[PDB]
């Protein structure tokens, strides 16, 4: 009886397994309520029930264990964490906890944790003690994330143009500037698919803020990583909670010297959600957004960095532009010189169905000298010197007609 | 007899046919009171009286049966539902209930439910836990709702342009951006007429929020579906109640693998009613509207989706723009990237009496690849590539002057490449 195993099984199968235990009011209930009832009926059997989840501490000091399957949504199937446990184990908001859970007594309304088996995929040890705020921050350039999954596929074409224009490194702040209808939704999943095949050691998390539900289901069923999202029919507090949970889990995993990658969608809408949630403090609003509010999402984007001790924390967020709203324009202007990697998309190139729509002249990475080989800098700069006088769309033709012949593996 | 039978009969017949039973002081009273009195006078005859209505459960735990004819308005002619009954039948706020009702007692003012005959057009067998919150959400491009009647009528012309510009699929989030005096009201009824004539299997519901009464009567007398409305002389709580009742009925009907379509008018007015009703707790507000309030209408628009299990839930809402109020501007800005289908109208094209006035260059549907045939995408792309360099006012001329010859099934036989 593993809680996570229940949460990953379809609701249609939950009815058959729950009805076979003597439960009748499961005819039309939510998956969380069904799982809670099934556990409470199986808890009467005195058998060991196992559970796990990502910790989130509330204001009162006890917190709960949110589920990654439910995108860290508050529900009856959550696990209560005692404050004394948080005093026994130095637990912060974001620690993945696994262990045996106990049945609820009279008047508790939530399950509680009996034993702490593992903390962040490791036994309860305090060896990995260096919190992310205390780790030194070198430049992103001490590794390259090559997105080259194959040799002769149409998918790798966009990834090959990405590798040629803006190399990706461990712990880089990626910023994808994209107008509407410019190939931004498939560009993210193309990167995510290439991440899992090329760098399986990296923990890949795709965060979708203020996204349509059908595209959420498309993404979470097509990417082999951890896809978390919050649909537009949810309050901005939900978006803020999901974003902070994801960033805290990433920080805690990086504290274990792991390489974590975050693909954030619509950072502008995340900043809008923050402006909505933050209790307005100063009346100095410009363009509709409170200034101090923008302090909160920046910190999110500020978490991405390379670590001198170990591991990395990579964040690639998409900045929406040409939306017609001055709010998104002000957000993008405030996020101008924050990232060390910028990937620009052109709407005019997407009109003529050239699907790699990267503005090569307006795309690049800072400190790319250490992200590439000594001889790799020369070829990329020579290629950029001849693309500079070219047109905005005529450059992509010149790229594809030469890139679709050979690979980036052994150039010439 | 049947309460519903009375609700659909004119008030003139309620007085003439009801006074013949011995009640003559119901003339100067409301239709709901007239129906209540007629039922109470016909109930003393010991004849089985049947009733039905859409369930609405209150906060206290009991519910009533609102009438679709009265646009789900609270009245004396409603049927009380006991909570204990709700414990036997795990009923939600959208379940349409039909069955035998009992007469009220002296001192009681509402009818009660004796027997539960049908639940959502079916025997009470709710063994499938197909609640909307648990159904999977595929994309809206499984089946296409084509608005091509083939009648070759000027009416079908606007619908033919609609099919050419933005195809409609099962379970789509439609957003009709429309300035004032640009052909919005006529565009909706054209869609509603084409839905009932082409796709009778779909349950069509036309929701009108903050609408004038004469236009409400115009709409409910021209659409072959279920027309529900709440006039502007009613509080915002009424608008919220009507909208939530409609969306819950749609959700419950989708739970039975049915294809439900919702034509919502003035989603901006629904968001305004929500902002009025929502208990402002967030001390922030932009443009006059509270931000947290906007969480409530979005969910309505968020309900529209395709379902992997069965049926669909289609919602096409009209977003008002260029009204001069920053409130509507903020609402439209918050609903910018929410829908997967956008149909824009231009007042300048409508000003020249070319009334379809569709902004072709800024209208379209995402993932339209699965809504059309393999060769239909090519023809649409070729047609859009030649409209792209044209203006707004000159594109509709080129479309209409060429569309009135063929029927959008032969329109792709000339200028082939
Ligand atoms: N690399 C590609 N290869 C093939 N087809 C693509 C590619 N990129 C985009 N497309 C097609 O073009 C469309 C581009 O839209 P996409 O989903 O990429 O994001 P977008 O439309 O820019 O995002 P938004 O919804 O915010 O406008 C897609 O629907 C897809 O069918
Ligand atoms: N399809 C059409 N064909 C011909 N004339 C039309 C059409 N649609 C609208 N009109 C003209 O426009 C006027 C009615 O348009 P409609 O009622 O759709 O405006 P509206 O935008 O809904 O109004 P409001 O801006 O007040 O909501 C009438 O005078 C009618 O002559």
Author numbering:
A (entry chain E): 1 to 412
B (entry chain D): 1 to 417
Q: Can you list sentences taken from the study reporting this PDB entry?
A:
Rho is a hexameric RNA helicase that functions in transcription termination in E. coli. The six subunits together form a ring-like structure, and the structure switches between an open-ring staircase conformation and a closed-ring conformation coupled to the binding and hydrolysis of ATP.
In this work, we report the crystal structure of a previously unreported contaminating protein, the transcription termination factor Rho from Escherichia coli, which was obtained during the structural analysis of a bacterial ATP-binding cassette (ABC) transporter. Crystals of Rho were unexpectedly obtained during studies of the bacterial ABC transporter NaAtm1 from N. aromaticivorans. Although Rho was present at only ∼1% of the target protein (a bacterial homolog of the eukaryotic ABC transporter of mitochondria from Novosphingobium aromaticivorans; NaAtm1), it preferentially crystallized in space group C2 as thin plates that diffracted to 3.30 Å resolution. The crystals obtained during the crystallization optimization belonged to space group C2, with unit-cell parameters a = 161.8, b = 101.9, c = 184.0 Å, β = 107.8°. Analysis of the self-rotation function calculated from the diffraction data revealed a noncrystallographic symmetry (NCS) sixfold axis offset ∼3–4° from the crystallographic a axis. The identification of Rho (molecular weight 47 kDa) was established by a mass-spectrometric analysis of the peptides prepared by trypsin digestion of the protein in the SDS–PAGE bands. The molecular-replacement results established that in these crystals Rho adopts a six-membered broken-staircase conformation. The relationship between adjacent subunits in the broken staircase of the present structure may be approximated by a screw operation with a rotation around the screw axis of 60.5° per subunit and a corresonding translation along the axis of −7.7 Å. Of note, the nucleotide-binding site is at the interface between subunits and small changes in subunit–subunit interactions may reflect the presence of different nucleotides: ATP in this structure and either no nucleotide (apo), ATPγS or AMPPNP in other open-ring structures. As demonstrated in this report, Rho can crystallize even in the presence of a large excess of other proteins, and thus it should be added to the list of known contaminant proteins in crystallography.
